[PDB]
Amino acid sequence: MNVNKKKLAEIFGCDVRTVTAWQSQGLPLVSGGGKGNEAVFDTAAAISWYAERDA
Amino acid sequence: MNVNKKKLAEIFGCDVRTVTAWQSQGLPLVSGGGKGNEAVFDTAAAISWYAERDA
């Protein structure tokens, strides 16, 4: 689902900054820029990415 | 974040029934029962479980 970065962090159970570090590592966003209610991610895409990195 | 089954489904990008099938496979719930706004899951626990399945 479409979520902002803080909501992504909450969903994953990580700090927000960890998501931004994940962006450095290839985590896709759906629409960009940065922290808070700016960068929008899709939960399903983040989970697929997450699962394909340490699974 | 504490979510119901339909919200877990939406987050993962699966049908609700896939979550119930995931429950058959060891997916932890935080508080149980069944479908819709009944069974409550934590997103971080579900993601950890999902990621540890097969990658």
Side-chain angles (χ1 to χ4, degrees):
Chain A
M1 60 159 33
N2 298 136
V3 301
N4 69 2
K5 192 187 298 201
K6 53 90 181 184
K7 178 46 44 75
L8 190 71
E10 295 302 320
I11 287 163
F12 272 74
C14 70
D15 186 88
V16 286
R17 297 201 182 270
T18 292
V19 174
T20 300
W22 283 354
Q23 295 178 265
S24 165
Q25 286 156 44
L27 165 68
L29 51 70
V30 317
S31 54
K35 289 80 191 293
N37 45 328
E38 185 200 354
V40 180
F41 307 77
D42 175 292
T43 62
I47 283 191
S48 173
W49 179 86
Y50 184 80
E52 299 235 295
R53 284 175 51 264
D54 297 92
Chain B
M1 51 171 24
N2 298 131
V3 301
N4 71 2
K5 201 184 297 203
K6 51 94 176 178
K7 177 47 45 70
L8 193 69
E10 297 169 34
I11 286 166
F12 274 73
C14 70
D15 187 89
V16 286
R17 300 199 177 269
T18 294
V19 177
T20 297
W22 284 355
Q23 295 179 265
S24 168
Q25 283 153 48
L27 166 65
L29 51 69
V30 316
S31 58
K35 290 79 192 299
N37 52 327
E38 183 199 353
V40 179
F41 308 74
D42 174 291
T43 63
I47 285 187
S48 173
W49 180 85
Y50 184 80
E52 317 191 20
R53 292 175 84 221
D54 267 352

